[PDB]
Amino acid sequence: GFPTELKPGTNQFLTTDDGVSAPILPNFHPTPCIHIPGEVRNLLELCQVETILEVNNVPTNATSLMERLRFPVSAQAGKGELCAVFRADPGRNGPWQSTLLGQLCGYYTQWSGSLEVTFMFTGSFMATGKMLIAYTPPGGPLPKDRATAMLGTHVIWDFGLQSSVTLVIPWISNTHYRAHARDGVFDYYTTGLVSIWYQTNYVVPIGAPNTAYIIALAAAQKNFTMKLCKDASDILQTGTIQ
Amino acid sequence: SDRVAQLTIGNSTITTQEAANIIVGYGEWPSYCSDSDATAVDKPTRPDVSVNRFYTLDTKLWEKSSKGWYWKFPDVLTETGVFGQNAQFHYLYRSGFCIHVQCNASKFHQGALLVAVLPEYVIGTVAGGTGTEDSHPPYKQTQPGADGFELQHPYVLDAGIPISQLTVCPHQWINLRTNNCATIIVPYINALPFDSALNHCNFGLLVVPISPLDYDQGATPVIPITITLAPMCSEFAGLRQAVTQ
Amino acid sequence: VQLQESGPGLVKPSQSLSLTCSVTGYSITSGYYWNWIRQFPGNKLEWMGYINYGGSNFYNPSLKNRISITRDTSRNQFFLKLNSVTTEDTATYYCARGGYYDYDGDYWGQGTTLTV
Amino acid sequence: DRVADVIESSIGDSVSRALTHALPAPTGQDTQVSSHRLDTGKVPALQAAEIGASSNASDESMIETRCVLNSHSTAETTLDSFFSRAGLVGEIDLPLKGTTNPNGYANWDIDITGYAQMRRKVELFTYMRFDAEFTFVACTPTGEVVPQLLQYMFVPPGAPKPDSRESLAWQTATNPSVFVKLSDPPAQVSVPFMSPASAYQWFYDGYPTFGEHKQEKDLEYGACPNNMMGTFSVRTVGTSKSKYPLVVRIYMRMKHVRAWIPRPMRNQNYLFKANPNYAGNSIKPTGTSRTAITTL
Amino acid sequence: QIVLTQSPAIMSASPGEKVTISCSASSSVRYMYWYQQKPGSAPKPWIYRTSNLASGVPARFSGSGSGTSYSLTISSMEAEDAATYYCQQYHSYPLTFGAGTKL
Amino acid sequence: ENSNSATENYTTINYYKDSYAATAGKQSLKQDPDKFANPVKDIFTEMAAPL
Ligand SMILES: CCCCCCCCCCCCC/C=C/[C@H](O)[C@H](N)CO
């Protein structure tokens, strides 16, 4: 017959190899496909949908789990007090783990692009106030006051008929891609910090509640991209499923 | 302009002055089944105006310690009117839906609700607490009827999935400081052109408070929630005697 | 988790009260609600207030403008303070850990007696 | 058709009206240069989340940006790139002594819900339609390779399942079967889409049959016959007992994948096959926790 | 504020008999909770969610009820389980207790 | 060759008469994000107030 030679790599089984295999049922024809709404073509379509971000991930007891989806705001002494802080890394352990974007990033090693966070105010109609939300690029420590925080990228939010504001976290990095940052030498891929401060005060008239809550939503921009698919960091099984 | 709206279908009309636009699920309007997609050979019936109309269910009360409720479609209308009669007289069924939720308060109240539609909402159990018992939910829990059912563990949606990612489904918010109604239009979702209206539920409707209701002493403490819904483009086939279940 | 109350056993009328609760085996910043409850000599129970895991407070309207609850996370204690104590404010004071609108942990202390 | 309302009626319109359409997107979006804006009436930063749509603000409308030409590919996030990777879905044991399968044969019901990784990956969507590729790896419990001959048979529903090592059903006159040795490389075949419906269902909210639904029949809730494709059977080819203990592992890879209606991902530990049960006394948060909201 | 009414105020029973006490609320509540207090000590949780037994509680205790009426019953009377019982609600703040029933 | 593939993926390789035995191949990069991210009846520009 035709002379041939065998090269190293024969008889191996590579799980990601794309090849041809013998069919088992000759002349088989599948059921026709009817139209079904909601078809998904690319996973990046789902990365642009907002989901709730658990900024307030402090409590752990069972009856208080639902409180993790909101953090409070109330009247202060008018001295630019701090409200809340969190990290901006989407693939890191913390608040971002509750979003669909974080879960999807858990399946990939590297990412690139801009992010955005939306805050919605759920107070009464008679409540007014102003807030300052700042983003600190890598290198700078956690700001100790509003005067230090204003030096970075920030937006000033005014309560009104429109109950939501959007903070955009622009892509500012030295490398084209970032791996998932964590403690150690891999903190080199960190993104920065986000802090919220009181601008003027929280003001209400007589007969209105003294406390209100804010809900945060997070998603990705149109230049977001991931690559080098991998396995997820956690396995939801503690034995044999049976 | 975008805050006032009127919905007219059949012989019913809904008006609102604090709307927040209309969401069309997955960007598709309801429609009838085409000739290339159908498989049954008998001619279906389309009652039109007698079935495609607004129906109002019971009313729930919103309190400072509420958890949430859910309903199953089209199980809610199985025993109501001409739609119910057609549903239990025929074997096959398909239709879309338009859902409207009402909840109003004053300018001194506060709170926020999440209204979402989740196709193929399967309910799970607590497995006896320890997780070693293979228990199953009762019949009254899987198809609660027009009364609905109250959630026990809203954080996992009683199915082991987080509520924080529920926004991936068609949804709207009811913020008491902004709006007092929510409108969602859902097409027919299934892997088959037709299905039974008694055995299968296409989707479930979830209403869960995320920001607790609050008010000061002396204000009205009763804040009801009402559900109104209407079928769209209904078809039936396979006529035989009426069976209730 | 163990709770222990401490404070003066006798207070003159029109003075100020201060009680202390020490928590062992659990951090007061990890969750749950920490309540103050007293039992009158007639065996009648009254709920006073609580402090949150994050530092939020809510008080009984009957005792409003006279009660204040604080905490010290470094030493893992939370405090109860009363203003202008009168004769009717004599009872056994308890400290308890509770859940959010439901039964979650509900472990009570031992109580301390107060005489005014 | 002479009355006016019938002529002008829209009953029977089978064309679905879509509000959106797909566009090519081989790379990420570029960034345009922008300058400062100081005016009234235009508020890109203010949104209304109550409507139910995501924010439409962009980089150019919030800060001053430069021009960046983006050439990062999006090919790795397609459905096949995400799904066309082999993973463990089954395992069959054939011990010499024991109680599980002591007679040199075994029957396995085909389901891919027995292992957490693949189940969690596939349960992101509600409906899926695909072809499959199956690979079988066989060896001893210690990983040794021995000279033994095996037979695999695919039994569609309604066909007689073998009940012994010498059953007459092994004649496989019509059923597809594979003969292979352990010394050979693992066997590998292709499988088409065989559901009676248009797609597989990972979630079925209903009952299979009519009638009264009593407590003793609650195990039928959520069972969709459209997903039951049959049985996988394996035996040692011989009339006498084999001399080695054997283990068979099954791996599956998807091709030509389509999906619909994404769902939230699983949060708690899996407990049972084809059942979304969870431990009610051990509910845990989705992520990790910290000590205070004002500190890292 | 929600007001809870307990009846009867004082009950006496013999060992082996059937004991049943009731607590009534001025408004509908989702659940009812029970406590037991021996003299000289602090109250201890006994029943929560009207059905579940607290840890270390004998199996002869049980509870039931719905809406605005709830009850606590003891299958068999022993000398050990004789103290004051209270009904408490978590529906709204402030939390309120019952008057108590001495057994 | 029978046209019995599940997607009857544009460039594949096959050696048999059944289409479902072919390789996965390459797809086309088309996305429709507005189906899930902005399914509103009336579209609003990102300059004006949404309400
Ligand atoms: C020598 C022939 C060996 C046959 C190997 C098995 C081929 C049959 C596989 C049928 C297709 C299974 C794909 C998944 C189907 C359903 O979704 C699962 N049962 C999920 O429950």
Numbering used by the authors:
A (entry chain C): 1 to 242
B (entry chain B): 10 to 254
C (entry chain H): 2 to 117
D (entry chain A): 2 to 297
E (entry chain L): 1 to 103
F (entry chain D): 14 to 21, 26 to 68
Provide the authors' original text about this structure.
Enterovirus 71 (EV71) is a major pathogen causing severe hand, foot, and mouth disease (HFMD) in children and infants, threatening public health in the Western Pacific Region. The capsid was composed of four structural proteins (VP1, VP2, VP3, and VP4), forming a protomer. VP1, VP2, and VP3 were on the surface, while VP4 was internal. Studies confirm that CT11F9, targeting conformational epitopes, has broad-spectrum neutralizing activity against EV71 and can treat mice infected with EV71.
To clarify the epitope recognized by CT11F9, high-purity EV71 particles were incubated with the Fab fragment of CT11F9. Cryo-EM was used to determine the electron density map of the EV71:CT11F9 complex at 3.04 Å resolution. Results show that EV71 particles maintain icosahedral symmetry after binding to CT11F9. Sixty protomers formed a complete icosahedral virus particle, with 60 CT11F9 molecules bound per particle. Three CT11F9 molecules were bound near the viral capsid’s three-fold axis with C3 symmetry. Results showed that the interaction interface of the EV71:CT11F9 immune complex was mainly composed of the C-terminus of VP1, the BC and EF loops of VP2, and the AB loop of VP3, along with the CDR1-3 regions of the heavy chain and CDR1 and CDR3 of the light chain of CT11F9. Besides van der Waals forces, there were 17 hydrogen bonds and 4 salt bridges. Hydrogen bonds included VP1 T292-T30H, VP2 S74-R30L, S74-H91L, E159-R30L, VP3 N56-Y54H, T60 S31H, N61-Y33H, N61-D105H, A62-D105H, T63-Y101H, T63-D105H, E67-Y34H, and E67-Y54H. Salt bridges included VP2 E72-H91L and E159-R30L. These results indicated that the neutralizing antibody CT11F9 recognizes a conformational epitope spanning VP1-3 of the same protomer, which can be used for establishing the IVRP.
